[PDB]
Design a protein around this ligand. Structure first.
Ligand SMILES: O=C(O)C(=O)c1ccccc1S
Ligand SMILES: O=C(O)C(=O)c1ccccc1S
Ligand SMILES: [Ca+2]
Ligand SMILES: [Ca+2]
Ligand SMILES: [Ca+2]
Ligand SMILES: [Ca+2]
Ligand SMILES: [Ca+2]
Ligand SMILES: [Ca+2]
Ligand SMILES: [Mn+2]
Ligand SMILES: [Mn+2]
Lengths: 262, 262
């Protein structure tokens, strides 16, 4: 029941496989889907590039390695509060100044996959979250909450992943009141399997991009392009979602990992 | 059971009874980066951070950056493909390795005093055996890290690389040290220096035995680890997970340790 026993126990169960590490990360490379914004509205974050330095050749006889062109907000990634104007004044709101204690926490996995398959603009509401809590247990302070949509099935095709038509991107997300409600429970942050933490059509919500707006307003975090949420239980897993320690970073690609039973 | 264990661990993380320790240095333009003889090999590039927008006409509501980022930059992870000796492992890339292996108990071997006295200090098999006699045997799947407090030098790249006419002078393991650890079936070896080997490992047999032997055995390397002085010799869990770079040879990481409180 001591912390040391918990950690030794974790170590043993990892070796035996009784605790499994789930990879919640998509592949990071040139094909990784990247956010597209209207050019008149904002500059785009760049597509990922991987450049060879050497691979056991005359440029590097005994070793292989690469360098990258890499936006902070690329692939499975982390949003720090400085990312949004509402979080701009937190001195601790950068990837290098935030509290790493907050990064590893129990995760609440809200399965919206059937609803999102039927309607790509599916919105998770405060009422639906409360019904989820009624069934699974209350969402608690410091916990991660992630919206499972199985949108990662589309990640091999950027067009399919952004899912845009004449009126813009169509991908599921939260309502402003859903995020407001989660924040009232003092969550650490909110995660999506889509290109961002907000619905594709959030550009037209009040406020616009409410997850971004409200999370970062409250010094909380966002996660995007999460994979393999279908391998997690609704309750009980621990999510590890840690940004690179980028100097004054607004966000970071991550290796999101989850600990799950069995 | 596994679920009860994860619930108990989750509660302790939320409460701080298990502390998350940041073992990562800041990643930015001033991060020390390996230098190689240009007649020998091309260099991995210095880190660059470039503004896309900061709540301005380029992006009115948000701030974000993009990076020039070598795989092998700052606190970072070496996958087996990084060395010629690990080239044939299909699971030897950051996107094909087994994430189950990345989280494990860590052995923190304090060589800080020895390293302050002699920057070319070498950890030997006999010294590791003496550490085990005091602290306990090193076990299968565990991380082993060499604490030197070299991270205290990261503010001055020249001091961090510490080169003179005969090359870099920084502490590391002997060949027999790495062979001994590998016989205990460790997952990986970590350093606070620019790489996993001693600065003078070029004249060793074999050259750069950490790189050579670790990756020969499909095991991992960690470099530029920070804050090992905040870890116990035994009992902590280390989380060291590379980005899921497509065919990646390594990656910057947010190295985090779990340490127990009471
Ligand atoms: O990458 C992000 O954090 C993200 O989702 C985003 C970034 C910039 C502008 C709008 C959005 S909606
Ligand atoms: O993998 C690394 O960053 C590393 O330590 C290294 C890389 C290339 C050449 C020599 C070394 S010694
Ligand atoms: Ca704390
Ligand atoms: Ca419709
Ligand atoms: Ca999958
Ligand atoms: Ca300096
Ligand atoms: Ca030499
Ligand atoms: Ca320290
Ligand atoms: Mn983002
Ligand atoms: Mn390296």
């Amino acid at each position: 029941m001591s912390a040391q026993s918990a950690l030794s126990g974790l170590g043993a169960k990892l070796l035996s496989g009784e605790v499994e590490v789930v990879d919640c990360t998509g592949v990071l490379g040139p094909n990784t889907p990247i956010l597209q914004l209207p050019p008149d509205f904002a500059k785009n974050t760049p597509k990922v590039e991987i450049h060879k330095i050497s691979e056991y050749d005359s440029d590097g006889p005994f070793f292989a390695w690469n360098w990258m062109v890499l936006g902070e907000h690329s692939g499975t990634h982390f949003d720090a509060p400085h990312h949004w104007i509402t979080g701009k004044d937190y001195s601790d709101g950068f990837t290098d100044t935030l509290d790493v204690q907050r990064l590893i926490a129990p995760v609440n996995v809200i399965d919206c996959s059937k609803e999102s398959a039927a309607d790509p603009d599916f919105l998770l509401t405060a009422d639906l979250i409360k019904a989820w809590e009624a069934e699974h247990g209350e969402i608690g302070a410091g916990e991660w909450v992630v919206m499972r949509t199985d949108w990662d099935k589309r990640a091999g095709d950027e067009a399919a992943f952004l899912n845009a038509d004449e009126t813009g991107p169509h991908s599921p997300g939260p309502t402003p009141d859903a995020i407001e409600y989660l924040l009232s429970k003092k969550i650490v942050g909110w995660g999506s399997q889509c290109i961002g933490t907000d619905a594709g059509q959030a550009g037209g919500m009040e406020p616009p991009f409410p997850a971004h707006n409200l999370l970062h307003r409250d010094n909380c975090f966002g996660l995007a392009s999460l994979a393999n949420l279908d391998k997690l239980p609704a309750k009980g897993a621990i999510l590890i979602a840690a940004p690179l320690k980028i100097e004054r970073g607004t966000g970071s690609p991550i290796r999101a990992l989850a600990l799950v039973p069995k």
